[PDB]
Amino acid sequence: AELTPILPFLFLGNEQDAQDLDTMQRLNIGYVINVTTHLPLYHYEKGLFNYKRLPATDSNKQNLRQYFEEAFEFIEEAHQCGKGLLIHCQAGVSRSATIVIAYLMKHTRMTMTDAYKFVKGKRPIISPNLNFMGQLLEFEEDLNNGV
Ligand SMILES: CCCc1csc2c1-c1nc(SCC(=O)C(C)(C)C)ncc1CC2
């Protein structure tokens, strides 16, 4: 099990990848985003990281656009103090990859397809979710208009 580095400070993984404490400390990670409703905050009692949980299920009606600005402010906090951030969910990495792509669209000014081809090249196994794709497509259209 390994942690996929999208950007040098932004990391994508799953339930199994987030339980490796030695690797996360070797990568200078201090922030963790859990994009699930039921997974525990791993290594919480150890007091090593800053946690933010985005309660979401892997359904065809779940809303992830509501969590974008909340997750961006948490990423910019890690970027501002030089620490890395790990965002994860489950095996399909659908929910966590949706947020990673949305970040690349806003602060890197990439298009959705280019940001998807970028993430897919680093983590090849991404389960598709048409609901989240429609939210990224509408979010891409709001970035091109000013929302
Ligand atoms: C997000 C953009 C995806 C896309 C744009 S154009 C195209 C795709 C695509 N996506 C997928 S799975 C990606 C997702 O659904 C996540 C939200 C979990 C990242 N499989 C096959 C294709 C073939 C053609």
Curated annotation (Swiss-Prot):
Tree of life domain: Eukaryota
Disulfide-bond pairs as recorded: none
Domain Tyrosine-protein phosphatase span(s) in chain numbering: 2-145
Residues annotated as transmembrane: none
Tissues in which the protein is found: Expressed in keratinocytes (at protein level). Detected in brain.
Locations listed in the record: Cytoplasm; Nucleus
Active site per database record: C89
Subunit structure: Monomer. Interacts with MAPK14.
Function per UniProt: Protein phosphatase involved in the inactivation of MAP kinases. Has a specificity for the MAPK11/MAPK12/MAPK13/MAPK14 subfamily. It preferably dephosphorylates p38.
Family: Belongs to the protein-tyrosine phosphatase family. Non-receptor class dual specificity subfamily.
Protein name from the UniProt record: Dual specificity protein phosphatase 10
